[PDB]
Subunit: 169 residues, 4 copies
């Protein structure tokens, strides 16, 4: 059960993006079965360029892509955009004070996708926005990886790789 850091990164002129999977959460039932209590998701980290081959991760902005949001990305038409809005303090007394918006847009010549994360603190009059262009080839890698990971994020791999053993017992 060793930890594996396997972020997938895209490095561009003005920004970098790293994408890391996060496992679903389970709880143990009295019977000893486990129940999925939280879906997995993907953590996106965006950082602005800060120097030659260097990005300022101290100023990174993050966004947690849910299973449904991954579904949006893997089904985008060639001229379709999607936009996701998250309040990181929903529930908590800081609700409504910060909005994170991830937008994904087609590049105007068909050559790929434009990702934008904007993190907006209205009371503080600050919008921190990071853009990164993603080629069609890079986006295809994401589609493949996203389709791969979805069954794991919803816990179905746990079901899948359990068939071979349970069938014997």
């Amino acid at each position: 059960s060793p930890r594996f850091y396997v972020g997938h990164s895209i490095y561009k002129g003005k920004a970098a993006l790293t994408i890391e999977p996060r496992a679903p959460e389970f709880v143990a039932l009295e019977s000893g079965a486990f129940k999925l209590t939280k879906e997995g998701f993907l953590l996106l980290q965006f950082a602005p360029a800060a120097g030659v081959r260097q990005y300022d991760w101290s100023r990174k902005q993050v966004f947690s892509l849910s299973v449904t949001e991954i579904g949006n990305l893997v089904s985008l038409g060639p001229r379709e955009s999607c936009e996701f809005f998250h309040d990181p303090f929903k529930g908590k007394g800081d609700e409504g004070k910060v909005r994170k918006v991830l937008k994904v847009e087609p590049l105007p010549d068909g050559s790929g996708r434009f990702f934008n994360l904007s993190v907006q603190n209205k009371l503080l009059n600050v919008d921190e926005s990071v853009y990164i262009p993603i080629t069609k080839a890079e986006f295809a890698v994401l589609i493949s990886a996203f389709n791969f990971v979805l069954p794991h994020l919803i816990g179905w791999s746990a079901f899948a790789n359990s068939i071979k053993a349970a069938a014997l017992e």
Copy 2:
């Protein structure tokens, strides 16, 4: 061989849907080999809304989606519908008294799919029908999960993950 509860759920205004995979069944042969005697399937559970963030699972209706039916869903055209009819007491002396019909339809503006389960007891003059709208993004998650699970439901994962070991022995 611990049990894993990993239902995938979609919660909407008037209804909820949870989808749970079910493993194929095997029997042990004299030689010690195992033979697949029943394909796996997906169990769909639909429940009508019953209160704030609450659904009446005591009034749930269920439908067992076969491998072939999953195949229908993963191959639907954008304007195509499919409809499945099941008699839950086929064979048994209650045959013909109850019909369950699952219909899947395109939403009229291209924004996703409409699922409907209708469970009809004619002798009792009752039709219990639950509808739930599924966005294009949510349906894409299902397509990915369904394509993932199909090889497991037909027992081919058992073949797949056996290659690495048998090859040695």
Copy 3:
């Protein structure tokens, strides 16, 4: 390393088809590494109907679908057909005496595929031909299963599931 019989079957009015995967073959090298010496394939068995819910497997005809042939099937256009020709005694002194031809054709109304296996013994003036219609939904199940199995048939799953362990050692 127990044996698993996991044929996937399609049963129709006049014929049945069962499809069984077969593993690649390896040899052990002096160093202890293994080398893939034969790709895996799929074994198709066709049988004509012989009675109520019964097929005459004693008169079955078989065809071994190679990796490349699977590739043809998973890339067929909607109006495209493919046809494969095999001599089961190529090399052997019976070469040229028996031809097996598998043809896969679109159904004229878009509703699926028509599979035909014809096994022809010219010296004996016999053509034994079995046809089976496959719905779009059933064909979609095959496409999913075929795309799943291809990496296993070429031995890449062996590479894939070895990463997690070798990385530690």
Copy 4:
């Protein structure tokens, strides 16, 4: 942790191509976690025909296909080409002296793809170029295998097959 040689080969009249996966590289951290330090890739080896059913592997040329390049291949449109340029001695004092170019083109009648590797040593006035035609069916096998392997090359399979165990511990 036995080594597996599982190159996938295509043998044609004038040339052969073999494609072998290569695992990502990890390093062990003090905590005992592992960190991915180099993505996996695919090694392509091209050899010109040298005799009946024989190819001159002593004159082979090789090209390392990155994850992003695999992404290009799996997203090619039917009339689209892609071309990759590599300097094998980038950094090293031999930088700029040798260029390897892999080009992938549609065949003019829609029947598949033309792969070309050209390895050019300008100071030596030599261009060694190997071409191999790939049918639509053979290319489909590659697309399936490439989509399969991508999540392993980026280390996400390591994440995937770790969920089942970590969840318990």
